[PDB]
Amino acid sequence: MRECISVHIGQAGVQMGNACWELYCLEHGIQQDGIIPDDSSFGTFFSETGSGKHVPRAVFVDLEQTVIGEIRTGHYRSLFHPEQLITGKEDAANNYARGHYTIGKEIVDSVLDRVRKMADQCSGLQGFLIFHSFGGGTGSGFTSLLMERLSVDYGKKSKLEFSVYPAPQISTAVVEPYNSILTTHTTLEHSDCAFMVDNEAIYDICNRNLDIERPTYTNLNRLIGQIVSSITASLRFDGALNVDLTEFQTNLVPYPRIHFPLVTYSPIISAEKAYHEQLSVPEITNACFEYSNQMVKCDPRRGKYMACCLLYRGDVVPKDVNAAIATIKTRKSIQFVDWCPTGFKVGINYQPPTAVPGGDLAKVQRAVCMLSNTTAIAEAWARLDHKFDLMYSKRAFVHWYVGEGMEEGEFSEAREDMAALEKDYEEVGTES
Amino acid sequence: MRECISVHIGQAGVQMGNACWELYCLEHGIQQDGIIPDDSSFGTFFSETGSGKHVPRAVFVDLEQTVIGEIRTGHYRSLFHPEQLITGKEDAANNYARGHYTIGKEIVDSVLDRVRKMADQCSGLQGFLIFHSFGGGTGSGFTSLLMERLSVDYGKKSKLEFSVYPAPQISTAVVEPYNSILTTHTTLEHSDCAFMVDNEAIYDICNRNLDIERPTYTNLNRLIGQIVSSITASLRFDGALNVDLTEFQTNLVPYPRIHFPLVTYSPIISAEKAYHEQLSVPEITNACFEYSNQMVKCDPRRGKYMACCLLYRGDVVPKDVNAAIATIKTRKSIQFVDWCPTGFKVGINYQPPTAVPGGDLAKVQRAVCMLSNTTAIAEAWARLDHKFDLMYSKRAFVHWYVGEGMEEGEFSEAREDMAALEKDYEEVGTES
Amino acid sequence: MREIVHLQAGQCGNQIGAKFWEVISDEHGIDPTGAYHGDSDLQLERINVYYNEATGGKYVPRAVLVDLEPGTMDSVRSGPFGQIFRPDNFVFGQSGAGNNWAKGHYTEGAELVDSVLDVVRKEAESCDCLQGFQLTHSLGGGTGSGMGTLLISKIREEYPDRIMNTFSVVPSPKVSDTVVEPYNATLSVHQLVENTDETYCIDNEALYDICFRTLKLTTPTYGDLNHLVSATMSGVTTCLRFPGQLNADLRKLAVNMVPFPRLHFFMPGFAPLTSRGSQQYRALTVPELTQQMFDAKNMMAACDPRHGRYLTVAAIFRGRMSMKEVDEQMLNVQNKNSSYFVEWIPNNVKTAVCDIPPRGLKMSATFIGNSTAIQELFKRISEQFTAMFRRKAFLHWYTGEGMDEMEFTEAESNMNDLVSEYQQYQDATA
Amino acid sequence: MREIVHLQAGQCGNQIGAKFWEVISDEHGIDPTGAYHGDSDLQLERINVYYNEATGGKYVPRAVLVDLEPGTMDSVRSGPFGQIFRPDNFVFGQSGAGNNWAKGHYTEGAELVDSVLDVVRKEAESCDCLQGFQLTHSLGGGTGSGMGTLLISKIREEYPDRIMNTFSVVPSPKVSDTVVEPYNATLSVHQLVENTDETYCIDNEALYDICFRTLKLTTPTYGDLNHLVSATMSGVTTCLRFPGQLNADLRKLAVNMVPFPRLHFFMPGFAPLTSRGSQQYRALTVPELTQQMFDAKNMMAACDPRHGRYLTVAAIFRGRMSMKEVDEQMLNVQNKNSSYFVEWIPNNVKTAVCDIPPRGLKMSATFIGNSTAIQELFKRISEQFTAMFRRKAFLHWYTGEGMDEMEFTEAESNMNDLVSEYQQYQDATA
Ligand SMILES: Nc1nc2c(ncn2[C@@H]2O[C@H](COP(=O)(O)OP(=O)(O)OP(=O)(O)O)[C@@H](O)[C@H]2O)c(=O)[nH]1
Ligand SMILES: Nc1nc2c(ncn2[C@@H]2O[C@H](COP(=O)(O)OP(=O)(O)OP(=O)(O)O)[C@@H](O)[C@H]2O)c(=O)[nH]1
Ligand SMILES: Nc1nc2c(ncn2[C@@H]2O[C@H](COP(=O)(O)OP(=O)(O)O)[C@@H](O)[C@H]2O)c(=O)[nH]1
Ligand SMILES: Nc1nc2c(ncn2[C@@H]2O[C@H](COP(=O)(O)OP(=O)(O)O)[C@@H](O)[C@H]2O)c(=O)[nH]1
Ligand SMILES: [Mg+2]
Ligand SMILES: [Mg+2]
Helix, strand or coil: CCCCEEEEEHHHHHHHHHHHHHHHHHHCCCCCCCCCCCCCCHHHCEEECCCCCEEECEEEEECCCCHHHHHHHCCCCCCCCCCCEEECCCCCCCCHHHHHHHCHHHCHHHHHHHHHHHHCCCCCCCEEEEEEECCCCHHHHHHHHHHHHHHHHCCCCEEEEEEEECCCCCCCCCCHHHHHHHHHHCCCCCCCEEEEEEHHHHHHHHHHCCCCCCCCHHHHHHHHHHHHHHHCHHHHCCCCECCCHHHHHHHHCCECCECCCCCEECCCCCCCHHHHCCCCHHHHHHHCCCHHHECCCCCHHHCCEEEEEEEEEECCCHHHHHHHHHHHHHCCCCCECCCCCCCEEEEECCCCCCCCCCCCCCCCCEEEEEEEEECCHHHHHHHHHHHHHHHHHHCCCHHHHHCCCCCHHHHHHHHHHHHHHHHHHHHHCCCC | CCCCEEEEEHHHHHHHHHHHHHHHHHHCCCCCCCCCCCCCCHHHCEEECCCCCEEECEEEEECCCCHHHHHHHCCCCCCCCCCCEEECCCCCCCCHHHHHHHCHHHCHHHHHHHHHHHHCCCCCCCEEEEEEECCCCHHHHHHHHHHHHHHHHCCCCEEEEEEEECCCCCCCCCCHHHHHHHHHHCCCCCCCEEEEEEHHHHHHHHHHCCCCCCCCHHHHHHHHHHHHHHHCHHHHCCCCECCCHHHHHHHHCCECCECCCCCEECCCCCCCHHHHCCCCHHHHHHHCCCHHHECCCCCHHHCCEEEEEEEEEECCCHHHHHHHHHHHHHCCCCCECCCCCCCEEEEECCCCCCCCCCCCCCCCCEEEEEEEEECCHHHHHHHHHHHHHHHHHHCCCHHHHHCCCCCHHHHHHHHHHHHHHHHHHHHHCCCC | CCEEEEECCHHHHHHHHHHHHHHHHHHCCECCCCCECCCCCHHHHCHHHCEEECHHHCEEECEEEEECCCHHHHHHHHCCCCCCCCHHHEEECCCCCCCCHHHHHHHCCHHHHHHHHHHHHHHHCCCCCEEEEEEEEECCCCHHHHHHHHHHHHHHHHCCCCEEEEEEECCCCCCCCCCCHHHHHHHHHHHHHHHCCEEEEECHHHHHHHHHHCCCCCCCCHHHHHHHHHHHHHHCCCCCCCCCCECCCHHHHHHHHCCCCCCCEEEEEEECCCCCCCHHHCCCCHHHHHHHHCCHHHECCCCCHHHCCEEEEEEEEECCCCHHHHHHHHHHHHHHCCCCECCCCCCCEEEEEECCCCCCCCCEEEEEEEEHHHHHHHHHHHHHHHHHHCCCCCHHHHHCCCCCHHHHHHHHHHHHHHHHHHHHCCCCCC | CCEEEEECCHHHHHHHHHHHHHHHHHHCCECCCCCECCCCCHHHHCHHHCEEECHHHCEEECEEEEECCCHHHHHHHHCCCCCCCCHHHEEECCCCCCCCHHHHHHHCCHHHHHHHHHHHHHHHCCCCCEEEEEEEEECCCCHHHHHHHHHHHHHHHHCCCCEEEEEEECCCCCCCCCCCHHHHHHHHHHHHHHHCCEEEEECHHHHHHHHHHCCCCCCCCHHHHHHHHHHHHHHCCCCCCCCCCECCCHHHHHHHHCCCCCCCEEEEEEECCCCCCCHHHCCCCHHHHHHHHCCHHHECCCCCHHHCCEEEEEEEEECCCCHHHHHHHHHHHHHHCCCCECCCCCCCEEEEEECCCCCCCCCEEEEEEEEHHHHHHHHHHHHHHHHHHCCCCCHHHHHCCCCCHHHHHHHHHHHHHHHHHHHHCCCCCC
16 A cells, blocks of 8 residues: 655665665565565565566666666566666766756656656555765766656655765765755755765764674665664554654654754664673663764764654563653753754554674664754754865866856855755754 | 458568468467368458368559569468469559559559459458558559559448558658658548558667567567557457447548548567566556657657547456546646547457567567557658658659659649648647 | 660670679579579579570570670680570670770771670560660770660660669779770760669779778789679669568669769669678678768779768668668768758668678678769869860871761760759759 | 777887786686686676677777887787787878977878777777777877877867876986977977876886885886786776776766866876785785875876875775775875875865776775876976977977977976966965
């Protein structure tokens, strides 16, 4: 009945998607193909055919064709519908203009059609899940191009996006500040709720809590795979207090332009050191509010919380959830904004998280995913805007962007909009 | 009881006929000969003899004798009656005048006699199926000569013709605009309904949907073979809501001079990518209205529909057909002309389409053939008339036509008639 | 059916023809003794297009060999595939033409033309359905230029409706092989423009380039050049002899290639052509064949198409191919070079695809192009002709054989008009 | 898709290129005969980036070899992996350039450039999606400096949007190998700064140090130096040919490495480089590879980065590695050497990680650094150029070939401006 269309943009989204759909297939008994061996709630993500083959309800789009070409040769070659996997001629080359104005224009009409063929095949449309990179290229331009196209064809339908936000210190591209601001300016008015994660933050978690000194990108993706499973577990499984994707919009977004929650997942524990842990509900709930466990390298205590969604899983008792949240509300260090006395949205599900073979997480009994909107993220935007200001003041790389469909003015408009958003975060955080 | 006389003119018709009669023999258990191995509805196309030999009710006529000479040496050498295969001395040499005035006059009295020997052998005559090329030669002159002869000997009997309409960009002859207009001028008043197909349009379909980069003419013909089987499936097989060849005339032709429907066939899908498709009735019905699946390279949305015939096959439920058409009627992009509130003629048949061994189409369960009359085809006529106007203004190739039985005036009369028809299409498309 | 009768002339025609009949006999399995030993039966089905049958499986070409000197044919009959021809078809005189058009046309060939016609009519009347006449000659010689055009006029007056196609070797611009070429060419062309349907202009200098550049041949004899001419002559008459996805009869080409009556001069081509060492570096597919077909370096005529515009074009493919590729390539060529194609012709390409390729090749193609750039050839000859004619350079050799100076002026005027007409239709609409 | 077409020039380019195609063919399993015998199928998936296919599994490099003298290529085709190249791609003249830029650019190469373009266009048009052109030459010679820059201008005018990357050997400061180097370098650079996207400056003296110091090689031939240049040229084009955790296209590097249009001169590097006896004393892990990548002693350009600041940097890793290590090391380098990185660029490192390493190595890395210290190289050449030019040291050899003294002044002014621009952006904000 319910449905979720997954759009995976760029190398990040495509590689994150590989982990998501390896988990979903495992959460439903699927056999790396559309086949199920000789397992009934899959309908939210998997379309079914008379052959016994289940087809993921996802669209893989990339202007580059090396990452997707690896899927077609991978173990999941025979899972996805071949026309879902869309590849272009030449990548965006870390340039927002190429992704949005020159190359995106030649693929957007193709991905949008395949989305259409999926939207009309659903008994009822619930929302879109967008996976993309914030660093730039396809993830910055194509997404903002696609987001604007979905906003008109589908209007009020929910649009949730999972963004790999740039890390404070770590960086892999030189023009991230240009791409980060340009995409944000064109996605504020077309996105409902953007869940942020940082590679650096997960890198800390992967060694600080999981005992691994050599995290690859596969490890980070498998951690992100768990989060999305938890977010969509209510649709996929039964529970005591369920939550729907359209509930996040109102619960977490007090104002239309402030829709950037952080992310967390408490029981990120090594298998060996799990033998010495009780892993009770009150303790994991407290771990969510520690700076040491955030998946975005932004310290919550530098700001004030504005909304929180606690999505429990597995063996959980709602009485314990009530107690743990009550104590957390008591702590003075954990500060909520005054104009939000009602601070928590709670969701409980009966399905324990499943562990991917060859993975790193322990076989936990119960888990909680926390989605918190905080004013602390205002610091990250200010830091990002400073980096953009340094480069733009010198016109460090402008000639690349101006010469591929964009214009000089858009740099000024994008930055001032980010200034307004940073101002808005300040007004929200002050009272009387 | 029912009957259909198939006349195949020129190289196109003869080669298209080779595919049609390879399909019919397969649709009836025939064994590449008139024999049926140790299968009862064939009577519509096959005459029967006491020897157990079934004789196709078709006439192959060509002024050239290389294509037909290949049939006599082919696998179906012992299928057709030797006097059905009529060959001439010298071809028409891409000249309409030769086919209509000089060489046709020496064969028309021979093909018409064999038609007579078939018309009187039928328990009841239903109509004629004409296969020919629009590019020129025999297909342009001989057909218009034959069409006028059938119009008098048989009067009101239905005359359906399948034309290989010239493509917009692709071309194989230099004088197509001369032949296309000349034959059209002499076939408007003698033809009931002309189904159009373009080589370019099927070329797009054969690689865009069937995964083949090397379509030969055999591939295109096998696609056209399916269409004619669907059109005549009601006569050949049982169904829930049957349709007869005489019904197309009234359902699709609002006005006597506007009888040029397009053609479509939805489930044109590769065998491998069919495993990832549900192929339900609503989706295939929607595919018929996409420009990406038309068998004529004319965009329907550039104009307004005027009539549509949906001929379903195989496992189809009339309730689903009702729903799918209802939704399509709802879509605003799919625009029907105002003066035709009743837009659809529907036909349902229980026989699933059969796949030719060595073919490219998948073993589909249900299929739909759509025959739509649209004002968009007015653009094609205007484009064709422009090409004729350029050549004729210079008298580029006139000397060939004038010197072989034709006259200078006929060029002017033919073109002005096409101008009137283009004007007529405009009047029909406007209201109040 | 649709029989073709082959006429020779001069030393050039007889040498080219002897090679053409060796190639044709090769693709039909005909031994030099006349017996048939082919493998595929298809090559035998339409063998009547060129050959007549006899007892014991002997096949006799429908060829007429004529020259004013017997030295050339005595070489033909003595060489390989020379005993194939019917002895009665060797029609010849004793005193040759001294490379002067007047002698071959008015004096020497005039008294011998009747002997040839008596063989032509006998050959033609044996055809179930006569398609046309095929003449091979040279415009720079005396027999071919003079007698060949005399035959053309005689046959055209006797078979007005049949198609007559000439494969004429044209004098090269770089170097000549006969001092009186401008007189022979101008006078011969004065006849061709009125009494033939499609002339395939070729020149040796261009074939020298092809052997030197493409084939990388270091010892190109006239046998190598004649093989190139043979291949194109075989190409344009393959639909008559073999089946294909799309056929093209000789009249089919003439209709599509000749917009106006007098613009019937074509410059042929062929592909693939590769050296023995460069064969392992080629894909041998439709996209590249179409690429070198339109390459000005691969055409058998001196005139470069880049200097003018294509009125029309034909591409007779051979071998089993994807029809989709063929149409896409022709359209691709049309789009890129839109400046090279005349604009008042919406489509400038006529396509055909035969199913059987030449022996030893999986694929092949023959290019035929009617281009306004051919006006350079005739204009160049006009400049040479008027130079010599301005001061009676060699007239006495011509006027003494029966000609008159008026005919010289008429021939030049007609050639200039044709050059004007080719130039006129090189300009766009209005 | 994303095909690269390789252009040679002079003796330097032809010698470097011959080694590059031996290395590339090694990692793709291509035998010297052209057949493929690789084990992993991944090396065959993207083989179209450099190679064209033919019948029988033969793969033909998309390479154009050009020189004004055939002695060099005759060595190329006679040596190993020389028969691989398509014979038609060897475009050459007879009279070489006397190490003077004027002859190669205006007089000798001018009449031969058209022959090369006709091969370049034919090669380029066969690409499904053309990524860019790759040119190997030398700025100190006559063919490479003169003709190579002439080709660059011609291609840039014909393919404006495509990326053009040059791997140019730069004259060394210590000792010269051509008396007129300042004229060839200055004139060649005057063209590069306007008509190329990313130039990889290298000099032999630096590679001599690497062989002497790091590899401890006692008999370093030019084959050893060219192998070093080959490895870096293979490194920057591995993402196009193999998958990885994080890809970097040629345009991906140019965007991240070229802040301003004219500052597109890079000094490459490579790692690991160890002697045969010192291999058993190394861990061979990411932390040390990143350590010697930024070591000034391991860079293939004379200019030392310590004398200036890095505008940007790229680190194209190869082999399966921990992404955490890579980012931590790049950040670690960034923190320690914060004085060496320009401050108005918040992040000065572009990272990439290919999954497949070079044959025989578990890990590898290619360093590309755009540094203001490169201004030393051009300033040094300016000092030599102005010294000779001050008293017409050798002009008559240049002005006699068609050049003019004004062009000499313009070239020097342009080079001085570029040196000024590099110096200007070496200062912090305000
Ligand atoms: N978590 C995670 N992040 C990734 C992964 N791959 C790339 N990224 C992030 O993506 C950011 C840059 O955007 P990319 O995805 O690499 O570029 P793109 O979206 O493909 O757009 P183009 O530049 O046109 O290729 C980097 O800073 C990485 O942090 C991955 O596998 N997992
Ligand atoms: N679909 C399809 N079309 C064909 C086929 N063969 C020829 N045609 C079309 O026929 C058009 C030209 O008319 P032809 O059939 O070739 O000529 P004709 O009818 O034999 O008349 P003549 O010129 O006298 O030979 C071309 O433009 C082709 O598109 C075929 O096998 N399949
Ligand atoms: N390709 C080719 N050309 C020839 C041959 N013989 C003569 N020619 C050409 O014919 C011209 C000479 O005229 P020729 O035919 O010998 O005089 P004719 O005998 O009176 O017709 C010159 O331009 C020659 O290049 C030949 O065997 N092969
Ligand atoms: N690494 C390397 N450098 C070379 C080679 N051949 C020449 N060079 C360099 O090229 C410069 C000489 O110019 P050269 O290319 O020979 O002149 P050209 O043939 O006209 O381009 C000198 O600085 C040499 O150091 C070679 O095989 N390998
Ligand atoms: Mg990418
Ligand atoms: Mg025909």
